[PDB]
Amino acid sequence: EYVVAKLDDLINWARRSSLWPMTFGLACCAVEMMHMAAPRYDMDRFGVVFRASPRQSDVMIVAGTLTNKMAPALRKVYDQMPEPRYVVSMGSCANGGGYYHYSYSVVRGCDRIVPVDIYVPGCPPTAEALLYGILQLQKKIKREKRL
Amino acid sequence: QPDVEWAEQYGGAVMYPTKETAHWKPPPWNDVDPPKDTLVSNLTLNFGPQHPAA
Ligand SMILES: NC(=O)c1ccc[n+]([C@@H]2O[C@H](COP(=O)([O-])OP(=O)(O)OC[C@H]3O[C@@H](n4cnc5c(N)ncnc54)[C@H](OP(=O)(O)O)[C@@H]3O)[C@@H](O)[C@H]2O)c1
Ligand code: SF4
């Protein structure tokens, strides 16, 4: 009744505590994604530990432009993730092409390939604005399993 | 006198010939031809696409 309701929040507290990102070296957004590891604006053991390998991680951050050559590649990586998974599409390329969009190769918005939970709009995604991409992620995890 | 026709019977094969099996070939004079053929042993890798840390 009360113990059951608090135990579900305790499991959700583990995702609120720590989430491991994926080092998607996809574009210029990946350089600012490296700035999350940079000391001045840090999530290093604040709630983020870089390790790579899609099998171990909990959150994958799509960091830039995706093309038709990359659409089969990213899709199965998301499938290689453990079932409690979150996708953060960071940048205008990740939201529907920086420019592009009306281009031949670029797939529009990532959502055509892989579903996204948290959007970051910033081209040069400022590390200040990037910090929401992990903090809002933890805030969005509220309730899991009622019955 | 003995000729080449009698010498061909004593050639490298099976001495007495016949038998159920005659798949064996005379040995090469200075060991076998290189079995350079078969098995490329080329290992293919998909190292790139996304996140190789490199
Ligand atoms: N075996 C078969 O494949 C077969 C054969 C012949 C006919 N059919 C028909 O085809 C349909 C197949 O559907 P399905 O069985 O694949 O659906 P399902 O997997 O049972 O999914 C139904 C979803 O609706 C929610 N839901 C249903 N009743 C609920 C309730 N009383 N309270 C709260 N949430 C509820 C569930 O959410 P939660 O999980 O969060 O509760 C669940 O995610 C059936 O309706 C059946 O009539 C199926
Ligand atoms: S959104 Fe801007 S910074 Fe990010 S990959 Fe596209 S062009 Fe580069």
UniProtKB/Swiss-Prot annotation, chain A:
Chief place of localization: mitochondrion
Binding site for [4Fe-4S] cluster: 28-29, 93, 123
Cofactor(s) the protein needs: [4Fe-4S] cluster
The record's free-text note on cofactor binding: Binds 1 [4Fe-4S] cluster.
Post-translational modification: Hydroxylated ar Arg-51 by NDUFAF5 early in the pathway of assembly of complex I, before the formation of the juncture between peripheral and membrane arms.
Residue positions where Hydroxyarginine is found in the record: 51
Molecular function as annotated in GO: 4 iron, 4 sulfur cluster binding; metal ion binding; NADH dehydrogenase (ubiquinone) activity; quinone binding
Gene Ontology process terms (BP): aerobic respiration; electron transport coupled proton transport; mitochondrial electron transport, NADH to ubiquinone; mitochondrial respiratory chain complex I assembly
Quaternary organization: Core subunit of respiratory chain NADH dehydrogenase (Complex I) which is composed of 45 different subunits. This is a component of the iron-sulfur (IP) fragment of the enzyme.
Protein name: NADH dehydrogenase [ubiquinone] iron-sulfur protein 7, mitochondrial
Organism: Bos taurus (Bovine)
Gene from which this protein is expressed: NDUFS7
Parent-record interval covered: 64 to 210 of 216
UniProtKB/Swiss-Prot annotation, chain B:
Modified residues (N6-acetyllysine): 25
Location(s) in or outside the cell: Mitochondrion inner membrane
Membrane-spanning segments: none
Domain of life: Eukaryota
Family: Belongs to the complex I 49 kDa subunit family.
Role this protein plays: Core subunit of the mitochondrial membrane respiratory chain NADH dehydrogenase (Complex I) which catalyzes electron transfer from NADH through the respiratory chain, using ubiquinone as an electron acceptor. Essential for the catalytic activity and assembly of complex I. Redox-sensitive, critical component of the oxygen-sensing pathway in the pulmonary vasculature which plays a key role in acute pulmonary oxygen-sensing and hypoxic pulmonary vasoconstriction. Plays an important role in carotid body sensing of hypoxia.
Subunit structure comment from the entry: Core subunit of respiratory chain NADH dehydrogenase (Complex I) which is composed of 45 different subunits. Component of the iron-sulfur (IP) fragment of the enzyme. Interacts with NDUFAF3. Interacts with NDUFAF7. Interacts with CERS2.
Protein name: NADH dehydrogenase [ubiquinone] iron-sulfur protein 2, mitochondrial
UniProt organism field: Bos taurus (Bovine)
Lineage: Eukaryota, Metazoa, Chordata, Craniata, Vertebrata
Gene of this entry: NDUFS2
Residues of the full protein shown: 38 to 91 of 463
